[PDB]
Design a protein around this ligand. Structure first.
Ligand code: NAG
Ligand code: NAG
Ligand code: NAG
Ligand code: NAG
Ligand code: NAG
Lengths: 118, 105, 119, 108, 426, 120, 103
C-alpha cells in the first residue's frame, strides 16, 4: 500500500533549518526503489529537489545542492529532508514519493504538508 | 583578508563532558583546518580539511561545519586536551588564524 | 614443406669446440622457436634448449647451460649450436626441432647430425 | 536544466469532447530511443497522480481514454472523451537530464 | 578454479590465422532484471586478480552524460566457472557511496583477501577538466572478496587518508582501472597535476623529424588538456604500504620521461610474474603504449615498439597517428599480455579511423596482429574496453568489458565477453 | 623523517633587518612542499608571514609585502626570512613550517620556532 | 626437474594386438606431455600432442589418455610398421625431460 505520509513544522523562521520527515507504511525503504522529495509552489509549479535510494545514495537538485540534505532511518523506516537557510520564496507544499519501476516517474505520492515561511 | 573568529575566546570544560569549539568566517571558505598548540610547543595540525582527523589525533575529536561556520567537537574530553585551538582558512590568500584555550575544570 | 636440415656428421677431438648448423626452409623462420635435443646412441633423448629467432631469446637446460650456446640468424634463416670443451661422453646425435602448438611440441624434426668426440 | 512550457495554460472543454495539451521541452528528452516524458494529474486538494509514464504507456488502473503521444521536443496529451472527473492540473515532467523539472499547470 | 596467469604457454594458438578461431561468449556479472530500462551506465571499472574481481559503475537516469545519477556501485566478488567451462563474474560484496556525484576515477587493487579501491572525492566536477578548483581529496574503500555473515568493518571499511606524499606535483589522483600488489604494497595507476610553468621539457627532445606539419613545442602543450592549461598531467603510480604504520603514506611515483605523453587512464597488471604498464594514448601518439615494468619505484617502463595496434581518435588526431599535434582525445583500449616469449597480448580494440566503434578482440604480436574477432556489428559504437586474462582449469581466458552502445537497446550497459584463447590453430 | 631548525639573533634593534635561517634535514627544498614562515606574537595569535614554494615562487602577506623576503639555498638545504624594517610590534616567536598549500592534505609539520625579541 | 618414467622398458607385441604404454611423472603435470615414435636410424616423429590430441598424417590407432601423473598410450590393431622406440616428453616445467623408452 505504501502510504507515504509527510510531517514536520508548517511554519519556519527565515534563514533557519527546515526539517521534514516522511514515513513509509506497508513497504521497506531499504529494499528497492528511490524516495523523492518534491515541492510545489503556490502557483502550482512543481519542483524536484532530490531522492535517496534504497542503498543510501542521495541525488540532489543542482540548483539546491548547497542547502539540501536527504537522510534515512532504517530502524524506523523513515527518511528526512533538511534545508539550510530557508528564505521567503521557499514556502511550498512538500510531498514525499516513491520512484517507479524505472526510477524516473513518481508512482505513489504522499499527502503533502504546506510549509510557510513567515 | 578573510577574518576568522572563534566564538568562545576562553572556553571552559570540566573533564569527560562534551565540548564544542566554533570558528566563524567573514566570507565563504571551503576548508577550515584546526591546529592544537600547547604552551612551550609549536602548533600541530589536528583536524585538516573540515572533518578529517590528522595523524595521531584521537578519535574523540570530530570536525564539522560548512560555509562560514565550522566546529571542533570532542565527545569525551580527557586531561590531555587542555590546549589552544586555532582555525585556519586556506581558500584565499592570506592565511588567517584565531584564538581560544581550554581549562582543566 | 617445413624442412629442417642439419649440418653433416662431425669428427671432433676432445677438448676442442664444435659448431653445428640447422637450416629452416618452407616457412616464416622468425615465427616459431627452434629447439635442440640430444640423443646418446642406445639411450633416451635429452632436451638441451631452445632459441627464439623472433627476438633471439634462448633458454637452456641446467646440465647444458655452461656446455652449449645457441645462436640464430634470420639473414640465412639458420640456427647454430656451439659446444665447447667436450668430454668424450658427447659422442651423440643432435636434433633441431620446430616448436609448434605454442613452442614445446616437436612436430618437425631435423635429420639429426652426429658428433663423435674421441682421439 | 530543461525549461518546460505546456499550452494552453487556460483550457476549458465541454463534456464528450477531445482535450489536447501540448508540452514544449527546451532540449531533447529522447536519448537512446527512450522518451523521458511523464504526465501527472493533480486533483485540487490531492497529490499528483501518475497518468502516463514514458510518454506512451498507461499506468495500472488508469482509464485508457488518457492517451499520451509525441516525441523529441513536442509532446501531446489527449482526453477522449472527458467527464466530470478531469477537473485537475496536468503536468508534463522531463527526466532526461538534471534536474527533473516539471511543467507548469493546466487549469482544466 | 580461476588462477593468475603464470607458467609456460601450453595448448593454444599463437600464429597468424585468417579463420574464425575465436569464440567470444556473452557473460554477465548479474542477471538482467526483467521489465527495467531507461538508465545509462557510465565510468565502468573492471579489475581482476587471483580469481577475484571488482566492478564499479555510475548508473544514471536519462542522458548518458548529464542525467541524474541513480547509483554508484563498487562491488567485489569471485570469478567462478559458470557451469560450461566458461568464467563469469559473481558479485559477493556490494557498496554504494552516499554521494555518487562526487566519486570520480576509481582505482582498484587486490591484496590479501581484501580489495582496496582508491577513488577521488570532488565537489567541483570531474578532477581532470576543472582541476584548478579541485580539492585533492581521495578515498580508500576496503571490500572483502569473502564477506562473512557478521563481520562489520571487515566486509566494508573506509580507510582514512591522512598522509599524502606527492613531491613537486600540485595534486594527485588515481587515474586508472587496476593496479598491482608487491608484498604488502599497493600500486594504483594514477596521475599528477603539475603546474605548467615548472614542467621541465627539452623542446628538441620530442621527435618531429618525419612530419612536416608539427612545431616542436606541440609535444609540451599536448601534455595538458588545453594548450593554455594550468596543469599538466603526468602519469604514474600511487603507492600504499599497508605495513607503513597506523596511517600509511600514499606516495606518488612519477612515470619515466621516456616516450612522455599526457596522463591518461593507465593500468599496471602482474602478468606472467612481472608487472606490465599500459598508459592510454590520450594524445598525439596513438600507437598503443604498454610495456614491461623495469622498476616499480621509480616507474621505468620499457614500452613496446608496437606498430599495428592503435586507437580511434577524433579529428586532427586519427588512428595510427605519430606526429606531435595538440590534441587531448582518445579511448581506453587496454591489452593483457598472455605470452612473454614473443610478447603476444590480447585485448579489445576499436577498428574505425575517426569514430569510436567496431570493438574487435585482437590477439597480436609487437608488429603483427595474429587473429581478431568482431564482438558486435561494424557500426556498433564502443567507447572503453578493459581486458584481463587468466587461467581457468589450465585454459587462458580473457574477460573483457566493452562500452557497447548498440542500437535498439532501451537500457545502456557495458557488455562482458569471455574469450578463450583457442586451443587449436585451425 | 625530517626536522626544521630555526636560527638567528634573538635580540634585534628596532628599525634593523631581522634574519632567520631555517635548516631542513631529511628532505629537499626543490622537490617537495610549500615552505612557510609563520609569526606568533606575545599574545597567542598566529600570523602567516608567507611562503616560498618548491619551484621558487614567493608569496607574501599583503600586510607585510613591503618588508618581507623569503629566499632559499638548495645546496645548504635551508631557507631564510629577512625583514627589512622591524618595529617593536615584531617581538614574536617565529616558526618555519612545511605544508601543501590549499591542498586537501596539508600535513603541516612545524619547527619549534625561535622567540625574536625587539627592544633596546 | 620432473622425471618421466616409461613402463615397461621393453615389450613384445604380436601384430594385430592392442598394447598400452605407461608414462609416469614425479610431480603433477596437468595435461602437457607428448608421445613420439622413433624407428631405427630415424629421427623421432610426433604421434600425440598434449596427451590426448592426434596430429595429421598419423593413423587413428595411436590414442593418448590420462592426466596428472599416470599417462597411457594405447595402440590397437598393431602392425609391423609400429615397432620402434616410444617417448613421452612433458612441457610445463622448464627442463623438458623425455622418458626412459619403451619397445
Ligand atoms: C570548477 O568547479 C568550481 C567549483 O565551485 C566551479 O566554481 C567552477 O565554475 C568550475 N569550473 C568549470 C565547470 O569550468
Ligand atoms: C635540449 O636539447 C639539446 C639537444 O642538442 C641540447 O643541446 C640542449 O642543451 C638541451 N637543453 C637543456 C638540457 O636545457
Ligand atoms: C613497506 O614498509 C616496510 C616497513 O615499514 C618496508 O620494509 C618495505 O620495504 C616497504 N615497502 C616498500 C618500500 O615497497
Ligand atoms: C623499442 O625500440 C627502441 C629503439 O627504437 C629500443 O631502444 C627499445 O629497447 C625497444 N623496446 C622494446 C621493448 O623492444
Ligand atoms: C584510414 O582508413 C583507411 C581505410 O579505411 C586506412 O587505409 C588508413 O590507414 C586510415 N588512416 C590512417 C591514418 O591510418
Amino acid at each position: 500500500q505504501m502510504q507515504l505520509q509527510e510531517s514536520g513544522p508548517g511554519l519556519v523562521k527565515p534563514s533557519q533549518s527546515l526539517s521534514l520527515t516522511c514515513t513509509v507504511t506497508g513497504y521497506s525503504i531499504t529494499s528497492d526503489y528511490a524516495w523523492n522529495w518534491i515541492r510545489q509552489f503556490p502557483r502550482n509549479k512543481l519542483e524536484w529537489m532530490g531522492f535517496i535510494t534504497y542503498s543510501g545514495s542521495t541525488s540532489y537538485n543542482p540548483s539546491l545542492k548547497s542547502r539540501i540534505s536527504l537522510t534515512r532511518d532504517t530502524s524506523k523506516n523513515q527518511f528526512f529532508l533538511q534545508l539550510s537557510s530557508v528564505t521567503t520564496e521557499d514556502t511550498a507544499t512538500y510531498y514525499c514519493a516513491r520512484s517507479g519501476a524505472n526510477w524516473d516517474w513518481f508512482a505513489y505520492w504522499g499527502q503533502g504538508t504546506l510549509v510557510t515561511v513567515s | 583578508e578573510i577574518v576568522l573568529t572563534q566564538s568562545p575566546p576562553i572556553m571552559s570544560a570540566s573533564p569527560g563532558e562534551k565540548v564544542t569549539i566554533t570558528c566563524s568566517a567573514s566570507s565563504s571558505v571551503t576548508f577550515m583546518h584546526w591546529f592544537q598548540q600547547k604552551p612551550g610547543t609549536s602548533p600541530k595540525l589536528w583536524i585538516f580539511s573540515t572533518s578529517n582527523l590528522a595523524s595521531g589525533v584521537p578519535a574523540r575529536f570530530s570536525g564539522s561545519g560548512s560555509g562560514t561556520s565550522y566546529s571542533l567537537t570532542i565527545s569525551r574530553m580527557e586531561a590531555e586536551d587542555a590546549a589552544t585551538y586555532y582555525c585556519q582558512q586556506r581558500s584565499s590568500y592570506p592565511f588567517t588564524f584565531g584564538s581560544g584555550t581550554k581549562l582543566e575544570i | 614443406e617445413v624442412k629442417l636440415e642439419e649440418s653433416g656428421p662431425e669428427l671432433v677431438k676432445p677438448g676442442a669446440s664444435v659448431k653445428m648448423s640447422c637450416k629452416a626452409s618452407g616457412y616464416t623462420f622468425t615465427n616459431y622457436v627452434m629447439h635442440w635435443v640430444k640423443q646418446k646412441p642406445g639411450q633416451g633423448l635429452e632436451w638441451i634448449g631452445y632459441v627464439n629467432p623472433y627476438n633471439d631469446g634462448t633458454q637452456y637446460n641446467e646440465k647444458f647451460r655452461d656446455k652449449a650456446t645457441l645462436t640464430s640468424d634470420k639473414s640465412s634463416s639458420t640456427v647454430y649450436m656451439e659446444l665447447n670443451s667436450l668430454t668424450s661422453e658427447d659422442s651423440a646425435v643432435y636434433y633441431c626441432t620446430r616448436g609448434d602448438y605454442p613452442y614445446w611440441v616437436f612436430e618437425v624434426w631435423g635429420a639429426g647430425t652426429t658428433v663423435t668426440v674421441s682421439s | 536544466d530543461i525549461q518546460m512550457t505546456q499550452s494552453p495554460a487556460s483550457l476549458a472543454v465541454s463534456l464528450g469532447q477531445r482535450a489536447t495539451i501540448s508540452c514544449r521541452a527546451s532540449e531533447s528528452v529522447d536519448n537512446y530511443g527512450n522518451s523521458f516524458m511523464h504526465w501527472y494529474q493533480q486533483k485540487p486538494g490531492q497529490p499528483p497522480k501518475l497518468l502516463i509514464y514514458r510518454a506512451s504507456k498507461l499506468e495500472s488502473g488508469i482509464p485508457a481514454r488518457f492517451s499520451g503521444s509525441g516525441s523529441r521536443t513536442d509532446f501531446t496529451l489527449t482526453i477522449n472523451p472527458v467527464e466530470a472527473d478531469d477537473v485537475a492540473t496536468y503536468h508534463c515532467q522531463q527526466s532526461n537530464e538534471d534536474p527533473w523539472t516539471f511543467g507548469g499547470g493546466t487549469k482544466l | 578454479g580461476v588462477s593468475n596467469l603464470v607458467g609456460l604457454p601450453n595448448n593454444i594458438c599463437l600464429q597468424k590465422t585468417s579463420n574464425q578461431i575465436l569464440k567470444p561468449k556473452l557473460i554477465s556479472y548479474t542477471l538482467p532484471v526483467v521489465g527495467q530500462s531507461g538508465t545509462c551506465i557510465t565510468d565502468p571499472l573492471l579489475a581482476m586478480d587471483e580469481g577475484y574481481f571488482a566492478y564499479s559503475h555510475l548508473e544514471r537516469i536519462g542522458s548518458c552524460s548529464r542525467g541524474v545519477s541513480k547509483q554508484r556501485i563498487i562491488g567485489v566478488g569471485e570469478v567462478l566457472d559458470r557451469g560450461d567451462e566458461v568464467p563469469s563474474l559473481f558479485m559477493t560484496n556490494v557498496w554504494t557511496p552516499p554521494n555518487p556525484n562526487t566519486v570520480y576515477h576509481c582505482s582498484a587493487v587486490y591484496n590479501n583477501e581484501f580489495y582496496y579501491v582508491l577513488c577521488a572525492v570532488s565537489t567541483v566536477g570531474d578532477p581532470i577538466l576543472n582541476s584548478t578548483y579541485w580539492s585533492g581529496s581521495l578515498m580508500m574503500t576496503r571490500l572483502a572478496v569473502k564477506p562473512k555473515s557478521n563481520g562489520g568493518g571487515y566486509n566494508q571499511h573506509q580507510l582514512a587518508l591522512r598522509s599524502i606524499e606527492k613531491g613537486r606535483y600540485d595534486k594527485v589522483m588515481p587515474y586508472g582501472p587496476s593496479g598491482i600488489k608487491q608484498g604488502d604494497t599497493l600500486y594504483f595507476p594514477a596521475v599528477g597535476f603539475l603546474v605548467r610553468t615548472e614542467f621541465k621539457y627539452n623542446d628538441s627532445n620530442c621527435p618531429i623529424t618525419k612530419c612536416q606539419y608539427s612545431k616542436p613545442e606541440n609535444c609540451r602543450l599536448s601534455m595538458g588538456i588545453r594548450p593554455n592549461s594550468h596543469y599538466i598531467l603526468r602519469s604514474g603510480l600511487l603507492k600504499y604500504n599497508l605495513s607503513d604504520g597506523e596511517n600509511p603514506k600514499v606516495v606518488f611515483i612519477e612515470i619515466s620521461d621516456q616516450r612522455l605523453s599526457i596522463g591518461s587512464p593507465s593500468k599496471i597488471y602482474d602478468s606472467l610474474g612481472q608487472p606490465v604498464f599500459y598508459q592510454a594514448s590520450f594524445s598525439w601518439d596513438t600507437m598503443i603504449k604498454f610495456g614491461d615494468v623495469l622498476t616499480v619505484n621509480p616507474l621505468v617502463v620499457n614500452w613496446r615498439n608496437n606498430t599495428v595496434i592503435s586507437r580511434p581518435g577524433q579529428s586532427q588526431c586519427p588512428r595510427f597517428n605519430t606526429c606531435p599535434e595538440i590534441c587531448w582525445e582518445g579511448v581506453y583500449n587496454d591489452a593483457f599480455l598472455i605470452d612473454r616469449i614473443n610478447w603476444i597480448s590480447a585485448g579489445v580494440f576499436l577498428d574505425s579511423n575517426q569514430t569510436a566503434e567496431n570493438p574487435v578482440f585482437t590477439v597480436f604480436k609487437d608488429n603483427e596482429i595474429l587473429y581478431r574477432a568482431q564482438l558486435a556489428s561494424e557500426d556498433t559504437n564502443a567507447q572503453k574496453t578493459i581486458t584481463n586474462c587468466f587461467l581457468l582449469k589450465n585454459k587462458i581466458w580473457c574477460i573483457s568489458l566493452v562500452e557497447i552502445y548498440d542500437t535498439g537497446d532501451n537500457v545502456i550497459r557495458p557488455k562482458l565477453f569471455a574469450v578463450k584463447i583457442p586451443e587449436q590453430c585451425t | 623523517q625530517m626536522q626544521l631548525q630555526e636560527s638567528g639573533p634573538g635580540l634585534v634593534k628596532p628599525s634593523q633587518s631581522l634574519s632567520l635561517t631555517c635548516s631542513v634535514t631529511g628532505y629537499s627544498i626543490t622537490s617537495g612542499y610549500y615552505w612557510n614562515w609563520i609569526r606568533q606574537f606575545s599574545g597567542n595569535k598566529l600570523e602567516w608571514m608567507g611562503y616560498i614554494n618548491h619551484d621558487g615562487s614567493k608569496n607574501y602577506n599583503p600586510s607585510l609585502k613591503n618588508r618581507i623576503s623569503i629566499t632559499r639555498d638548495t645546496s645548504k638545504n635551508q631557507f631564510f626570512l629577512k625583514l627589512n624594517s622591524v618595529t617593536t610590534e615584531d617581538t614574536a616567536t617565529y616558526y618555519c613550517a612545511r605544508d601543501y598549500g590549499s591542498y586537501y592534505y596539508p600535513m603541516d609539520y612545524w619547527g619549534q620556532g625561535t622567540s625574536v625579541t625587539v627592544s633596546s | 626437474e620432473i622425471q618421466m618414467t616409461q613402463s615397461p622398458a621393453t615389450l613384445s607385441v604380436t601384430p594385430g594386438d592392442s598394447v598400452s604404454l605407461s608414462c609416469r611423472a614425479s610431480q603433477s603435470i596437468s595435461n602437457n606431455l607428448h608421445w613420439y615414435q622413433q624407428k631405427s636410424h630415424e629421427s623421432p616423429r610426433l604421434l600425440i600432442k598434449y596427451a590426448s590430441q592426434s596430429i595429421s598424417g598419423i593413423p587413428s590407432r595411436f590414442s593418448g589418455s590420462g592426466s596428472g601423473t599416470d599417462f597411457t598410450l594405447s595402440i590397437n590393431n598393431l602392425e609391423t610398421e609400429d615397432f620402434g622406440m616410444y617417448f613421452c616428453q612433458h612441457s610445463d616445467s622448464w627442463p623438458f625431460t623425455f622418458g626412459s623408452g619403451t619397445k
